[PDB]
Enzyme design. Structure first.
Site, PDB file in Angstrom:
ATOM      1  N   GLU A 198       0.772  -1.244   0.000  1.00 38.52           N
ATOM      2  CA  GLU A 198       0.000   0.000   0.000  1.00 38.52           C
ATOM      3  C   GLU A 198       0.806   1.300   0.000  1.00 38.52           C
ATOM      4  OE1 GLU A 198      -1.015  -2.768   1.403  1.00 38.52           O
ATOM      5  OE2 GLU A 198      -3.006  -3.005   0.520  1.00 38.52           O
ATOM      6  N   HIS A 226     -12.191  -4.556   9.063  1.00 35.90           N
ATOM      7  CA  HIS A 226     -12.629  -4.381   7.681  1.00 35.90           C
ATOM      8  C   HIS A 226     -13.950  -3.627   7.511  1.00 35.90           C
ATOM      9  CE1 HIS A 226      -9.705  -7.594   7.606  1.00 35.90           C
ATOM     10  NE2 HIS A 226      -9.681  -7.600   6.284  1.00 35.90           N
TER      11      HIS A 226
HETATM   12  C1  LIG Z   1      -2.738  -4.069   4.119  1.00 35.76           C
HETATM   13  C2  LIG Z   1      -3.731  -5.021   3.452  1.00 35.76           C
HETATM   14  N1  LIG Z   1      -3.792  -4.995   2.097  1.00 35.76           N
HETATM   15  C3  LIG Z   1      -4.642  -5.804   1.425  1.00 35.76           C
HETATM   16  C4  LIG Z   1      -5.495  -6.700   2.111  1.00 35.76           C
HETATM   17  C5  LIG Z   1      -6.473  -7.651   1.402  1.00 35.76           C
HETATM   18  N2  LIG Z   1      -5.976  -9.031   1.501  1.00 35.76           N
HETATM   19  C6  LIG Z   1      -6.360  -9.876   2.521  1.00 35.76           C
HETATM   20  S1  LIG Z   1      -5.564 -11.425   2.370  1.00 35.76           S
HETATM   21  C7  LIG Z   1      -4.740 -10.888   0.926  1.00 35.76           C
HETATM   22  C8  LIG Z   1      -3.818 -11.933   0.321  1.00 35.76           C
HETATM   23  C9  LIG Z   1      -2.538 -12.178   1.168  1.00 35.76           C
HETATM   24  O1  LIG Z   1      -1.862 -13.296   0.577  1.00 35.76           O
HETATM   25  P1  LIG Z   1      -0.825 -14.105   1.373  1.00 35.76           P
HETATM   26  O2  LIG Z   1       0.003 -13.181   2.252  1.00 35.76           O
HETATM   27  O3  LIG Z   1       0.051 -14.800   0.389  1.00 35.76           O
HETATM   28  O4  LIG Z   1      -1.485 -15.138   2.302  1.00 35.76           O
HETATM   29  P2  LIG Z   1      -2.456 -16.387   2.113  1.00 35.76           P
HETATM   30  O5  LIG Z   1      -3.879 -15.981   2.209  1.00 35.76           O
HETATM   31  O6  LIG Z   1      -2.139 -16.935   0.731  1.00 35.76           O
HETATM   32  O7  LIG Z   1      -2.013 -17.286   3.245  1.00 35.76           O
HETATM   33  C10 LIG Z   1      -5.015  -9.616   0.537  1.00 35.76           C
HETATM   34  C11 LIG Z   1      -4.451  -8.856  -0.681  1.00 35.76           C
HETATM   35  C12 LIG Z   1      -5.358  -6.655   3.541  1.00 35.76           C
HETATM   36  N3  LIG Z   1      -6.106  -7.458   4.353  1.00 35.76           N
HETATM   37  N4  LIG Z   1      -4.493  -5.831   4.208  1.00 35.76           N
END
Ligand SMILES: Cc1ncc(C[n+]2csc(CCOP(=O)(O)OP(=O)(O)O)c2C)c(N)n1
Ligand SMILES: Cc1ncc(C[n+]2csc(CCOP(=O)(O)OP(=O)(O)O)c2C)c(N)n1
Ligand SMILES: [K+]
Ligand SMILES: [K+]
Ligand SMILES: [Mg+2]
Ligand SMILES: [Mg+2]
Lengths: 330, 362, 330, 362
Positions: free
Chosen positions: A60, A129
């Site tokens: 971000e 959220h």
């Molecule tokens: C700062 C922030 N940016 C975006 C999001 C939206 N978001 C929630 S989970 C996610 C994916 C994260 O992927 P990863 O770290 O690889 O973990 P996984 O779910 O695959 O274990 C995103 C973009 C968020 N919760 N917080």
């Protein structure tokens, strides 16, 4: 003339501005190949390619900062935050890098950029959220902040937002994305624009002024429908812009109704309703009041998960009607 | 009577993920030498004057001086085009000048007068010029901005590049690493530059960074460590870095090892975390202006009296600018609200209470 | 007797809490060996060592999160932000990681942490260094927010802040640090505590209620002294706490004076004064208000550098008096 | 008849700044094998049950399932003490169970009932337990927190460590790098763990990170890449990392290469960015439970009939838990404002309008 969802209205707006100015481009998490986290950018990447629609890493502060730099250099970026809750990590770039720059430079460095994405409460997403950021952003000089309700608002405001040469924050609503609205030929045109800084009277009325923004606007109209059956006519005002808000339209309405109720989804203290109420008391409409202005807001707690708790943490139609009846003393 | 040019040997840069670095030999013409000399001296005398004006209460708030780092701003400018782009932090008086602004406009902004480059609205930390984006007071924030300007360079296809500067203290900012990843991912023509003057305000590099090899913190992004007190080393490393980015190879990190004679800023004497002897030793042995001077004279590119004549003109230039900055009137109160928004119709801005209104024009 | 500066009062408070509980510790940029960016933590590192007073790199989001984690684990951290302008980089850890956790966990995970540092305007620091965050933080459930004015306020509130078992934001003021005040024997005690949530009447009055927080409180007392010579008696109220504010004390006063003026250094829209004005209109004191409440705030622009411009971007005594006279029609 | 223990070979870990890594062989006792199998199978059935309940609208909002990644939560638990600490993101159902909570309390939280571990206040992403700190919804935010929990262990001198988990998508968060620096600077007993399941929501690692060697992103911090589909491999690497941290050597990174069968969350079909054939190939070739089962049967640590009996017991435990979770009443509206502040006297909180008041008790 045709049924168009808020989601599709925003898509049309962005598609048209991209076609119109080669300097415009979109960037954010899952905006390209994924067709958008909430499908708002669907089909844009396929139509414009990697150069215009950019998927970003989950960074971000970083991509918001990159967007601001590109704007300073002459480009016109649209920076999407999956939800504004996540914009807190990048809020310094929005405020200190984008909003204050034109002023600090003495009018030499403009920043034509747009920050958009869903804002506020959704359905069962819990405390981290569900935060509304209208008051936070509306509080800052050098920034323009809008919060569309329906399809017309959405398309008109995003286009105007993109053509403006200053930073504009567009606070969308996830629950509104799938709502269809009657889209007139005027809104279908690629020249459709809604001026930033002007409110819209969604329903004419004479007994009380009800002001709101985003999703709650719909609940106000529902409340007005119910009250109408009892002989109470509500003048419902759709703010559209948070900063600079159209206080003139609200004051003119109060001068006719003598009553005011504000409805917002965010937390109460230091919220949007607080500013409207304070402005009413400082303005020429204060003496036209027959009863104190009151506020309908979300409950003063971090958003709970449980269904019954969440339902009572957000303003319901019955809460709007209750406050209106208290104000009219009926 | 004087040689038209001469060849000089320069220290080899340490490299990170680079098969070859900038040359270890470069040619300096008499014309360029005299120019770089005047430029560095102009910056030095400007900072010493600002220091004087600050003690006289003519300058307020923050005032970060760059004396000791003149080889950096002048060396970087010598290695890039007027059409290239640059952005740094708050210790930017030197860069503002090398990028085109006059000493008068810079000092007038520091004294908060209408004749300042920012009309007296920005002060020491916020100044802008053609292809110079400040002048940024939030540590680390300018790095993503620089990567964004680099994005625009690639987008426009004019072969321009962007130099993005940050200090050793700023090197531990999370957004810098977010910027490294995206710049590498999209092969942005961004030259990340860490100005290492050994201290982050009052915290030495050893106490702030687990690893003090700043030119390698980029990890996957290649980098080089340069002698930031030698203007020819900086110019040569800069030409190399610019050529690297112009060739479409993406971002590159360059660490400039330099030093600041003054404390972090006016309110910091700068001796609670370092000794006066250390400062003196650096000045005595590595001063950028002294280094170039000896090169000019020893190679017969210029004479000692010729350089002394330049010093006199420069001192005269700074005194005239200082007089202008001290006599130039403050901006008119009626313009307090000007420039909040660009390309908009005029409007009213609220003051200390509802009965105070300021006009705001773009 | 004993006279102590605000800076000294804060230092006394932290020192006493550190001695009282070994789990308390301070961390931030230049807090240790530098003796504090503004010298507030002077001498603490020499007395307690590297384990209790920790100098950190310039990584706000990072050390703020580390502080929150330490608190969740049982320690009682005092996290310093050089200025709150810099807290924007870590505001997500303050709001989403600390403030909302006890609620989200169902009362299982408390977060005894303190976030402190100078807030608001200073002298010539320009746009990115002059922002007031009182409104922003006081808007969030799960947090407690205080803004001390004098030495007594400072010492009592920092001690209460440290002993509280929830996240507490202490908005200090750089211009007040060097100001000396008479420090009574009571405040000298290591048991001196000021309850969070209670305002203090700094001056009794009968003609108008003047509410403020932080540095401006001093200006209100100055304005009250001038007006007193003209026959007007102001009841000056020092909020002390931004969240939860002591509206009861304010209401009780307005029920006696029939007039109200709020004074604050931050931006006007959605500011502290807005909430006070909205609460007064919604509460039992509205019927006692003989004239609308008005707000005195900082100018609605990013802070300019030039001396004359900055002087007119913050509320001056003359602006407070003007507003008061306008309110009393005199 | 049954062997009481057996030796198995495990993939050698790739190393970063480490002379030697975990052993490539380990001993598994019959008792431990039976426990690990039951634990992973319980996590698997709990997630499948969660999927079913979500489709029935009994669970709302977010619901991130961890099936396919069971060797991670059980393997990690098997390598630490109950007195050690752990924190992760939102895909935490497995960890909540391995750390000590019953399936009953977990499912009741997902269904938003009074008997939920968080009383129905948090839902899927926010669950806490003894020495388990969530269960965090903001990507990357949990990394600095883990470093802080690690700081507390050192501060109180308990000889405990903290495992701090984040996904591949989260690995590009600036605050993680800020945490790496401080953790190395203060030699915190923090084990940074990157769960690499190849995708960040819908973005593959190759499109999100310039460098996909997550175990090396720590740069100055050592690291090891581990097979996250092998329970024994995870256990061995964990015992190695924990011992490393308890010795006072500071932080270390551990990249667990795993895979998630479901999409990012319930609303993501999970096939727009990857093929169905890819998912099934991983399942038939690397399913964590299948791999352990095959090892135990082949080595005669347990019979196929015994493992089947465990499945039956687990399935019933899940069903009895889901029955409780769907029959348990919602929290009473009267307690909506409870637990806003800890250790404070009771007070009132405002509802949707000034006439709605909720009591708040700590
Ligand atoms: C700062 C922030 N940016 C975006 C999001 C939206 N978001 C929630 S989970 C996610 C994916 C994260 O992927 P990863 O770290 O690889 O973990 P996984 O779910 O695959 O274990 C995103 C973009 C968020 N919760 N917080
Ligand atoms: C996010 C943020 N944190 C803290 C500060 C306060 N601050 C201003 S300059 C500074 C020192 C930075 O040192 P360095 O990056 O090495 O640069 P130098 O001044 O030595 O060139 C600090 C801590 C700030 N401006 N912004
Ligand atoms: K714009
Ligand atoms: K506390
Ligand atoms: Mg430095
Ligand atoms: Mg992943």
């Amino acid at each position: 003339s045709l049924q168009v969802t808020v989601r599709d209205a925003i898509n049309q707006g962005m598609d048209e501005e991209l076609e119109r100015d080669e300097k415009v481009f979109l960037l954010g998490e899952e905006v390209a190949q994924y067709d958008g986290a909430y499908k708002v950018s669907r089909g844009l990447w396929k139509k414009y390619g990697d150069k215009r629609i950019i998927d970003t890493p989950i960074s971000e502060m970083g991509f918001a900062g990159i967007a601001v730099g590109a704007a300073m250099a002459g480009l016109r970026p649209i920076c999407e935050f999956m939800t504004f809750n996540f914009s807190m990590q990048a809020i310094d770039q929005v405020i200190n890098s984008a909003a204050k720059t034109y002023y600090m430079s003495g009018g030499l460095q403009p920043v034509p950029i747009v920050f958009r994405g869903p804002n506020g409460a959704s359905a069962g997403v819990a405390a981290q959220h569900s935060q509304c950021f209208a008051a936070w952003y509306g509080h800052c000089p050098g920034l323009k902040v809008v919060s569309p309700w329906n399809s017309e608002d959405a398309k008109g405001l995003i286009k105007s937002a993109i053509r403006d040469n200053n930073p504009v924050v567009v606070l969308e609503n996830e629950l509104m994305y799938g709502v269809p609205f009657e889209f007139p030929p005027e809104a279908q045109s690629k020249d459709f624009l809604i001026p930033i800084g002007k409110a819209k009277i969604e329903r004419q009325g004479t007994h009380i002024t009800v002001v709101s923004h985003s999703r709650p606007v719909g609940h106000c109209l529902e409340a007005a429908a119910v009250l109408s059956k009892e002989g109470v006519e509500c003048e419902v005002i759709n703010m559209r812009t948070i900063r600079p808000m159209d206080m003139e339209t609200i004051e003119a309405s109060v001068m006719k109704t003598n009553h005011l109720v504000t409805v917002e989804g965010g937390w109460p203290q230091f919220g949007v309703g607080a500013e409207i109420c304070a402005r009413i008391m400082e303005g020429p409409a204060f003496n036209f009041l027959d009863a104190p202005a009151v506020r309908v807001t979300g409950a003063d707690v971090p958003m709970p998960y449980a269904k019954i708790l969440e339902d009572n943490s957000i303003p319901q139609v019955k809460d709007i009607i209750f406050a209106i009846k208290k104000t009219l003393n009926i | 009577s004087f040689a038209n040019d001469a060849t000089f040997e320069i220290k080899k840069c340490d490299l990170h993920r680079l098969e070859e670095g900038p040359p270890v030999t470069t040619v300096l013409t008499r014309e360029d030498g005299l120019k770089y000399y005047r430029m560095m001296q102009t910056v030095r005398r400007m900072e010493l004057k600002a220091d004087q004006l600050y003690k006289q209460k003519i300058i307020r708030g923050f005032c970060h001086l760059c004396d000791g780092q003149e080889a950096c701003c002048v060396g970087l400018e010598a290695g890039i085009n007027p059409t290239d782009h640059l952005i740094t932090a708050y210790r930017a008086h030197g860069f503002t000048f090398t990028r085109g602004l006059s000493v008068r406009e810079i000092l007038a902004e520091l004294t908060g007068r209408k004749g300042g480059c920012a009309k007296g609205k920005g002060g020491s930390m916020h100044m802008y010029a053609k292809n110079f984006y400040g002048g940024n007071g939030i540590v680390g924030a300018q790095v993503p901005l620089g990567a964004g300007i680099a994005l625009a360079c690639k987008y426009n296809g004019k072969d321009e590049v962007c130099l993005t500067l940050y200090g050793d203290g700023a090197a531990n900012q999370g957004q810098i690493f977010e910027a490294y990843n995206m710049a590498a991912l999209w092969k942005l023509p961004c030259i990340f530059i860490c100005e290492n003057n050994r201290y982050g305000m009052g915290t030495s590099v050893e106490r702030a960074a687990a690893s003090t090899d700043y030119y390698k913190r980029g990890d996957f992004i290649p980098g080089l460590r340069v002698d930031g007190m030698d203007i020819l080393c900086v110019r040569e490393a800069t030409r190399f870095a610019a050529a690297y980015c112009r060739s479409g190879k993406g971002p590159i990190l360059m660490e400039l090892q330099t030093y600041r004679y003054h404390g972090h800023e006016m309110s910091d004497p700068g001796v609670s975390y370092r000794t006066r002897e250390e400062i003196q030793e650096v000045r005595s042995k590595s001063d950028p202006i002294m280094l170039l001077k000896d090169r000019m004279v020893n190679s017969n590119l210029a004479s000692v009296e010729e350089l002394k004549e330049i010093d006199v003109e420069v001192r005269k230039e700074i005194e005239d600018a200082a007089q202008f900055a001290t006599a130039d009137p403050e901006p008119p109160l009626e313009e307090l609200g000007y420039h909040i928004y660009s390309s908009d119709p005029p409007f009213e801005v609220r003051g200390a209470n509802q009965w105070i209104k300021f006009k705001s024009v773009s």
